[PDB]
Amino acid sequence: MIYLRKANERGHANHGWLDSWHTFSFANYYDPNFMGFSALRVINDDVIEAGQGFGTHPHKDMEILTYVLEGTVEHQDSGNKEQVPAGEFQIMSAGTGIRHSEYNPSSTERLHLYQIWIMPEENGITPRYEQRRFAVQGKQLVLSPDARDGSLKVHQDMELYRWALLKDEQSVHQIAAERRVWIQVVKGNVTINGVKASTSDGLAIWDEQAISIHADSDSEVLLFDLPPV
Numbered sequence: 001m002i003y004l005r006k007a008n009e010r011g012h013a014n015h016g017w018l019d020s021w022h023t024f025s026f027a028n029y030y031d032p033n034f035m036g037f038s039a040l041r042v043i044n045d046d047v048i049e050a051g052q053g054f055g056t057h058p059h060k061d062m063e064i065l066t067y068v069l070e071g072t073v074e075h076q077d078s079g080n081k082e083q084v085p086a087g088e089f090q091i092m093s094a095g096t097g098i099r100h101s102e103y104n105p106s107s108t109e110r111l112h113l114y115q116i117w118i119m120p121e122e123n124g125i126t127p128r129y130e131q132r133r134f135a136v137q138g139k140q141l142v143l144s145p146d147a148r149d150g151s152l153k154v155h156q157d158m159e160l161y162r163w164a165l166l167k168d169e170q171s172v173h174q175i176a177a178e179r180r181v182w183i184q185v186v187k188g189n190v191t192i193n194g195v196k197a198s199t200s201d202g203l204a205i206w207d208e209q210a211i212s213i214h215a216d217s218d219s220e221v222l223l224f225d226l227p228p229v
Protein backbone atom coordinates (compact mmCIF):
# COMPACT_ATOMS: atom_id res chain seq x y z
CA MET A 1 0.00 0.00 0.00
CA ILE A 2 2.97 2.23 -0.90
CA TYR A 3 3.97 3.53 -4.35
CA LEU A 4 7.54 4.67 -5.15
CA ARG A 5 7.88 7.35 -7.86
CA LYS A 6 11.59 7.16 -8.66
CA ALA A 7 13.28 10.39 -9.62
CA ASN A 8 14.08 9.33 -13.21
CA GLU A 9 10.44 8.36 -13.92
CA ARG A 10 9.23 11.91 -13.41
CA GLY A 11 8.21 13.69 -16.56
CA HIS A 12 11.24 15.49 -17.96
CA ALA A 13 10.95 18.81 -19.81
CA ASN A 14 14.13 20.77 -20.51
CA HIS A 15 13.51 24.16 -22.19
CA GLY A 16 17.01 25.62 -22.52
CA TRP A 17 16.46 28.12 -19.71
CA LEU A 18 14.32 25.82 -17.53
CA ASP A 19 15.12 22.14 -16.91
CA SER A 20 12.23 20.65 -14.94
CA TRP A 21 10.97 17.28 -13.62
CA HIS A 22 7.30 16.63 -12.96
CA THR A 23 6.04 14.24 -10.32
CA PHE A 24 2.58 14.61 -11.83
CA SER A 25 1.02 15.58 -15.14
CA PHE A 26 1.79 19.23 -15.93
CA ALA A 27 2.17 21.28 -19.17
CA ASN A 28 3.36 19.18 -22.15
CA TYR A 29 3.66 16.08 -19.97
CA TYR A 30 0.57 13.89 -19.57
CA ASP A 31 0.08 10.51 -17.79
CA PRO A 32 -3.33 9.51 -16.33
CA ASN A 33 -1.72 7.51 -13.50
CA PHE A 34 0.65 10.30 -12.40
CA MET A 35 -2.32 12.71 -12.14
CA GLY A 36 -2.33 13.87 -8.52
CA PHE A 37 -2.23 12.61 -4.94
CA SER A 38 -5.12 13.74 -2.70
CA ALA A 39 -4.67 17.52 -2.67
CA LEU A 40 -1.07 17.48 -3.94
CA ARG A 41 -1.65 18.22 -7.62
CA VAL A 42 1.84 19.29 -8.74
CA ILE A 43 5.41 18.69 -7.54
CA ASN A 44 7.87 20.33 -9.96
CA ASP A 45 11.64 20.19 -9.47
CA ASP A 46 12.94 23.19 -11.45
CA VAL A 47 16.40 24.47 -12.30
CA ILE A 48 16.30 27.96 -13.84
CA GLU A 49 19.61 28.96 -15.43
CA ALA A 50 21.12 32.29 -14.33
CA GLY A 51 19.27 35.40 -15.42
CA GLN A 52 16.18 33.59 -16.69
CA GLY A 53 12.65 33.25 -15.39
CA PHE A 54 8.96 32.90 -16.12
CA GLY A 55 7.23 35.95 -17.59
CA THR A 56 4.05 37.64 -16.41
CA HIS A 57 1.48 34.83 -16.20
CA PRO A 58 -1.80 34.41 -14.25
CA HIS A 59 -2.76 31.80 -11.61
CA LYS A 60 -6.21 31.41 -10.06
CA ASP A 61 -7.73 29.28 -7.28
CA MET A 62 -4.67 27.34 -6.12
CA GLU A 63 -2.46 27.34 -3.00
CA ILE A 64 1.07 27.42 -4.54
CA LEU A 65 4.17 26.63 -2.47
CA THR A 66 7.76 27.37 -3.48
CA TYR A 67 10.70 25.82 -1.62
CA VAL A 68 14.02 27.26 -2.75
CA LEU A 69 16.99 24.89 -2.55
CA GLU A 70 19.77 26.75 -4.37
CA GLY A 71 20.36 30.36 -5.42
CA THR A 72 17.59 32.95 -5.09
CA VAL A 73 14.25 33.79 -6.74
CA GLU A 74 12.81 37.30 -7.24
CA HIS A 75 9.01 37.45 -7.34
CA GLN A 76 7.00 40.35 -8.85
CA ASP A 77 3.25 40.44 -8.12
CA SER A 78 0.41 42.60 -9.41
CA GLY A 79 2.40 44.53 -6.57
CA ASN A 80 5.20 42.70 -4.75
CA LYS A 81 8.95 42.52 -5.50
CA GLU A 82 10.36 40.45 -2.60
CA GLN A 83 13.11 37.85 -3.01
CA VAL A 84 13.30 34.34 -1.46
CA PRO A 85 16.75 32.82 -0.70
CA ALA A 86 17.97 29.23 -0.38
CA GLY A 87 16.22 27.58 2.57
CA GLU A 88 12.99 29.63 2.80
CA PHE A 89 9.51 28.59 1.68
CA GLN A 90 7.00 31.02 0.19
CA ILE A 91 3.31 30.35 -0.28
CA MET A 92 0.60 32.26 -2.22
CA SER A 93 -3.06 31.20 -2.22
CA ALA A 94 -4.61 32.70 -5.38
CA GLY A 95 -8.38 32.05 -5.21
CA THR A 96 -10.12 34.85 -7.13
CA GLY A 97 -7.12 35.40 -9.41
CA ILE A 98 -3.63 36.85 -9.44
CA ARG A 99 -0.79 37.63 -11.84
CA HIS A 100 2.88 37.14 -10.90
CA SER A 101 6.21 36.67 -12.64
CA GLU A 102 9.11 34.75 -11.06
CA TYR A 103 12.76 34.92 -12.17
CA ASN A 104 16.36 34.24 -11.14
CA PRO A 105 18.01 37.46 -9.91
CA SER A 106 21.60 36.24 -10.01
CA SER A 107 23.63 36.49 -13.21
CA THR A 108 26.22 34.06 -11.83
CA GLU A 109 24.00 31.57 -10.03
CA ARG A 110 21.52 28.91 -10.97
CA LEU A 111 18.22 28.84 -9.13
CA HIS A 112 16.90 25.41 -8.14
CA LEU A 113 13.57 24.96 -6.39
CA TYR A 114 10.52 22.81 -5.77
CA GLN A 115 7.16 24.06 -7.08
CA ILE A 116 4.22 22.62 -5.13
CA TRP A 117 0.50 22.98 -5.91
CA ILE A 118 -2.24 22.05 -3.45
CA MET A 119 -5.94 22.24 -4.43
CA PRO A 120 -7.54 24.64 -1.93
CA GLU A 121 -10.63 23.75 0.09
CA GLU A 122 -12.70 26.37 -1.86
CA ASN A 123 -12.18 28.82 -4.73
CA GLY A 124 -12.45 32.60 -4.76
CA ILE A 125 -10.55 33.21 -1.55
CA THR A 126 -8.60 36.40 -1.12
CA PRO A 127 -5.10 36.51 -2.69
CA ARG A 128 -2.33 36.37 -0.04
CA TYR A 129 1.43 35.77 0.07
CA GLU A 130 3.30 34.65 3.24
CA GLN A 131 6.98 33.76 3.12
CA ARG A 132 8.96 32.38 6.12
CA ARG A 133 12.46 31.03 6.85
CA PHE A 134 11.42 27.53 8.04
CA ALA A 135 17.12 23.91 10.17
CA VAL A 136 19.56 21.07 10.91
CA GLN A 137 17.68 18.56 13.10
CA GLY A 138 14.01 18.10 13.88
CA LYS A 139 10.70 17.92 12.05
CA GLN A 140 9.66 21.51 11.20
CA LEU A 141 6.01 22.33 10.58
CA VAL A 142 5.83 24.36 7.39
CA LEU A 143 2.14 24.45 6.40
CA SER A 144 -1.00 23.88 8.45
CA PRO A 145 -4.63 25.03 8.23
CA ASP A 146 -4.46 27.19 11.40
CA ALA A 147 -0.81 28.43 11.14
CA ARG A 148 0.02 26.69 14.45
CA ASP A 149 3.55 26.34 15.93
CA GLY A 150 4.76 29.14 13.67
CA SER A 151 3.74 27.43 10.44
CA LEU A 152 2.15 29.29 7.52
CA LYS A 153 -1.50 29.00 6.57
CA VAL A 154 -2.60 26.76 3.71
CA HIS A 155 -6.26 26.88 2.68
CA GLN A 156 -6.60 23.11 2.72
CA ASP A 157 -6.95 20.41 5.40
CA MET A 158 -3.32 19.36 5.22
CA GLU A 159 -0.01 19.80 6.98
CA LEU A 160 3.50 19.87 5.52
CA TYR A 161 6.62 19.06 7.56
CA ARG A 162 10.25 19.69 6.60
CA TRP A 163 11.78 16.71 8.38
CA ALA A 164 15.57 16.87 8.75
CA LEU A 165 17.05 13.57 9.93
CA LEU A 166 20.53 12.41 10.90
CA LYS A 167 22.05 9.07 9.99
CA ASP A 168 20.34 6.10 11.71
CA GLU A 169 17.71 8.34 13.27
CA GLN A 170 14.16 7.04 13.04
CA SER A 171 10.84 8.66 13.99
CA VAL A 172 7.25 7.51 13.45
CA HIS A 173 4.51 9.66 11.97
CA GLN A 174 1.15 9.29 13.64
CA ILE A 175 -0.97 9.10 10.42
CA ALA A 176 -4.63 9.91 10.95
CA ALA A 177 -7.89 8.26 9.90
CA GLU A 178 -8.55 7.90 6.19
CA ARG A 179 -5.70 10.33 5.47
CA ARG A 180 -3.02 9.90 2.79
CA VAL A 181 0.68 10.95 2.81
CA TRP A 182 3.34 11.93 0.30
CA ILE A 183 7.04 11.84 1.10
CA GLN A 184 9.30 13.81 -1.22
CA VAL A 185 12.95 13.05 -0.49
CA VAL A 186 14.81 16.33 -0.77
CA LYS A 187 18.36 15.04 -0.36
CA GLY A 188 19.75 11.81 1.07
CA ASN A 189 18.58 8.21 1.53
CA VAL A 190 15.66 7.15 3.72
CA THR A 191 13.62 3.98 4.29
CA ILE A 192 9.85 4.29 4.78
CA ASN A 193 7.79 1.26 5.88
CA GLY A 194 10.34 -0.96 4.13
CA VAL A 195 10.74 1.06 0.94
CA LYS A 196 14.10 2.70 0.26
CA ALA A 197 14.05 6.12 -1.35
CA SER A 198 16.89 8.40 -2.37
CA THR A 199 17.15 12.07 -3.40
CA SER A 200 14.16 13.29 -5.44
CA ASP A 201 12.19 10.04 -5.11
CA GLY A 202 8.65 10.34 -3.89
CA LEU A 203 6.54 7.84 -1.99
CA ALA A 204 2.77 7.84 -1.70
CA ILE A 205 1.24 6.08 1.28
CA TRP A 206 -2.42 5.42 1.93
CA ASP A 207 -4.60 3.02 3.91
CA GLU A 208 -1.71 2.77 6.39
CA GLN A 209 -1.84 3.08 10.18
CA ALA A 210 1.63 4.67 10.67
CA ILE A 211 4.88 5.69 8.98
CA SER A 212 8.30 4.56 10.15
CA ILE A 213 10.97 6.66 8.47
CA HIS A 214 14.58 5.46 8.88
CA ALA A 215 17.25 7.93 7.86
CA ASP A 216 19.64 5.57 6.06
CA SER A 217 21.85 8.71 6.05
CA ASP A 218 21.63 12.41 6.85
CA SER A 219 18.70 13.47 4.71
CA GLU A 220 15.91 16.02 4.49
CA VAL A 221 12.37 15.08 3.41
CA LEU A 222 9.06 16.84 2.81
CA LEU A 223 5.98 15.24 4.31
CA PHE A 224 2.45 15.98 3.09
CA ASP A 225 -0.23 14.76 5.50
CA LEU A 226 -3.19 14.94 3.15
CA PRO A 227 -6.94 14.43 3.53
CA PRO A 228 -8.91 11.42 2.17
CA VAL A 229 -11.37 11.08 -0.77
Ligand code: NI
Binds near residue numbers: 054057100
Ligand atom coordinates in the same frame (compact mmCIF):
# COMPACT_ATOMS: atom_id res chain seq x y z
NI1 NI B 1 3.65 31.04 -11.50
